[PDB]
């Protein structure tokens, strides 16, 4: 019978179909993809970059 990863992938395909007929759902997935670093992460990165300048 089918492994777990293969179910996960099939479930992922169903959600990809949902994106095509639900503008609000697509927009929350695409907002997450392109969000970039959170302000919390960005604060941590700044310290990291600044402490290790040449």
């Amino acid at each position: 019978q089918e492994s777990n990863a293969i179910r996960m992938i099939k479930e992922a395909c169903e959600k990809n179909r949902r994106m095509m007929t639900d503008e609000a759902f697509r927009k929350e997935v695409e907002k997450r993809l392109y969000a970039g670093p959170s302000p919390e992460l960005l604060a941590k990165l700044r310290v990291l970059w600044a402490a290790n300048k040449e």
């Binding site: 492994s3 777990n4 990863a5 293969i6 179910r7 996960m8 992938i9 099939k10 479930e11 992922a12 395909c13 169903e14 959600k15 990809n16 179909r17 994106m19 095509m20 997935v29 695409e30 997450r32 993809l33 392109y34 969000a35 970039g36 670093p37 959170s38 919390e40 992460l41 960005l42 941590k44 990165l45 990291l48 970059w49 290790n52 040449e54």
Partner: protein, 390 residues
């Protein structure tokens, strides 16, 4: 925790900016490996460091902070990000977690929505690691797959696919919202060679690696058998796809669908003139008359059918075989009526027969300087009207 390998340098040439960004990225990745992996694991959107992708690691580099720089610095920071991914990949593998037995590799042409597919996967309790990256050149992936199978982990490779043209449209939107798109060179390289890479994985490791596919042109249809995955992914040669992509991004720019910035990042380091010159017109002709020009193509059995009619006034009756046009030699001047024009070529009727000019000459655009039906001289870029009334 050190990098799992030395980061390979690319050659940036006389571009001092990218050359120095490269060395800064390599220095950062090599000396701060520990703090970088820790930020990626604990603080980025990575499922606790189990979603491993070079494109997520790019967001931890100073050169990538500002949206408007990402297209320019991408190639310069890539290898540093990819080696950071391998290092991360190895750190996840070393964690003792007998419950977690499954490793998923996800790949696809940029703009195919592979990343969006990964975000729509929900982590299961048996999921050890999720890696997203190119498998067209699979050598690097061999080292990762080997390590999975040494640890008795089950490996699944998921190939996400879409026609280049529609994927290209998605890359434009990503460039405009996020600052990174994709070059036509990498898009064509990937879509042409991906089957070969997946072939090389099946032949090194066998049934031990499950290989599946997602066809995004058939509403994300899941494809289960390897032979069927190879079928779906057969979408042309590298020359064919590159040729089609070059025509698309040029037409898209010429008509005003994409800005110059979006066009330049899609161009990448491609000489478009050299792509356009490789285009073939052997089964094609142009029929001119008093109403306009009609582009026709021949089938295998010698039947002509219409592709495109363009209305134009003032041309006489004519039939021109486009594949028999003489290439324009550089430095010489050619005079006469333009009889056909597209994204790749401009065809001109001279006294010594039909001539073909590349639609681009040394990054200057010839095709926009002339109209079909117009009598001109073309030389070198000097274009003159020869139109008169007497």
């Amino acid at each position: 925790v050190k990098l799992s390998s030395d980061i390979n340098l690319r050659d940036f040439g006389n571009n001092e900016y990218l050359s120095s960004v490269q060395d800064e990225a390599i220095r950062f990745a090599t000396e701060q490996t520990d703090e970088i992996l820790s930020l990626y694991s604990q603080h980025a959107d990575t499922e606790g460091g189990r979603y491993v992708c070079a494109d997520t690691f790019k967001e931890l580099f100073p050169a990538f902070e500002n949206k408007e720089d990402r297209a320019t610095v991408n190639n310069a920071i890539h290898n540093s990000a990819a080696v950071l991914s391998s290092t991360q990949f190895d750190e996840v593998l070393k964690r003792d977690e007998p419950q977690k037995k499954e490793v998923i590799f996800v790949t696809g042409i940029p703009g195919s929505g592979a990343t969006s597919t990964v975000k729509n996967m929900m982590m299961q309790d048996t999921t050890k690691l999720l890696f997203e990256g190119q498998l067209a050149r699979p050598q690097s992936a061999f080292r990762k797959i080997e390590q999975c199978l040494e640890r008795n982990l089950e490996v699944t490779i998921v190939a996400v696919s879409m026609r280049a043209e529609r994927a290209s449209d998605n890359t434009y939107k990503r460039f405009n919202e996020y600052g990174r798109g994709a070059s036509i060179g990498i898009m064509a390289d990937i879509q042409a060679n991906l089957p070969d890479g997946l072939k090389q994985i099946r032949d090194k490791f066998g049934d031990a690696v499950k290989i599946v596919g997602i066809n995004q042109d058939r509403n994300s249809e899941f494809i289960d058998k390897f032979d069927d995955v190879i079928k779906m992914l057969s979408l042309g040669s590298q020359e064919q796809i590159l040729g089609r992509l070059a025509e698309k991004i040029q037409s898209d720019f010429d008509s005003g669908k994409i800005s110059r910035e979006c066009f330049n990042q899609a161009k990448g380091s491609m000489d478009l003139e050299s792509v356009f010159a490789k285009k073939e017109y052997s089964q094609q002709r142009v029929v001119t008359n008093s109403k306009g020009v009609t582009l026709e193509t021949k089938s295998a059995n010698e039947l002509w059918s219409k592709v495109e009619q363009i209305p134009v006034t003032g041309m006489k009756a004519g039939i021109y075989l486009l594949g028999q046009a003489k290439k324009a030699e550089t430095g010489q001047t050619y005079s006469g009526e333009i009889i056909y024009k597209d994204a790749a070529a401009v065809f001109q009727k001279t006294k010594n027969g039909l001539v073909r000019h590349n639609a681009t000459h040394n990054e200057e655009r010839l095709a926009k300087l002339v109209e079909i039906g117009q009598n001109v001289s073309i030389g070198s870029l000097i274009v003159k009207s020869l139109e008169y009334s007497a």
